[PDB]
Symmetry: C2
Subunit: 114 residues, 2 copies
């Protein structure tokens, strides 16, 4: 079903303190607006889902595999399914758009219940 | 594929049609496409088997998906299932929209490679 979204009206959910997420999806795509509070860590994880990210606001230190990059608006990244990554913010926090294919089923349920 | 980081100032631009300037990157299943559209420009009606989503970054875009028409501005987003007909137009300000495809659009991938 084709759809239009206003993100000011998409309810947010928190999988972990310091994170607020607004997730929408089609069949094979999920878009997730992640607002991360200052000085907050996303613990290291992997998943079969391919992921991409687009910086919108603030600063994010991202580790994908062996690499550690500091990311700001104007930057984007791609992560193959199965590749380990973790992240952290500094003083300013960040807003990052995460993209998954296929959608993350756990976030889908949390978005439904938000 | 291999993990990759991109600086948009370094991603080369291509134009599939007058009034459109694009920068595309892709993983395997995902393509991200930054589309700058000139003022008062029409995107002719099309359908594609690829799934599409879009995120407004700057300006204004009137988008028609199947039966519904909406005017989109930053703060808004859209989803288009594979095969669903859509068209769009800009007004005086033009726009910047982030288009997302799964799987990647073959034509855009080739133009990005040649950019
Ligand atoms: Ni992840």
């Amino acid at each position: 079903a084709p759809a239009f979204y206003d993100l000011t009206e998409v309810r947010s959910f928190s999988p972990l303190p310091g994170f607020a997420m607004q997730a929408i999806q089609g069949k094979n795509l999920m878009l997730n607006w992640v607002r991360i509070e200052p000085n907050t860590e996303m613990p290291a994880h992997e998943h079969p889902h391919e992921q991409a990210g687009v910086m919108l606001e603030g600063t994010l230190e991202l580790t994908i595999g062996e690499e550690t990059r500091v990311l700001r608006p104007g930057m984007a990244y791609t992560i193959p399914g199965g590749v380990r990554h973790r992240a952290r913010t500094f003083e300013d926090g960040c807003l990052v758009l995460d993209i998954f294919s296929p959608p993350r089923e756990d976030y889908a349920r949390m978005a439904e219940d938000a």
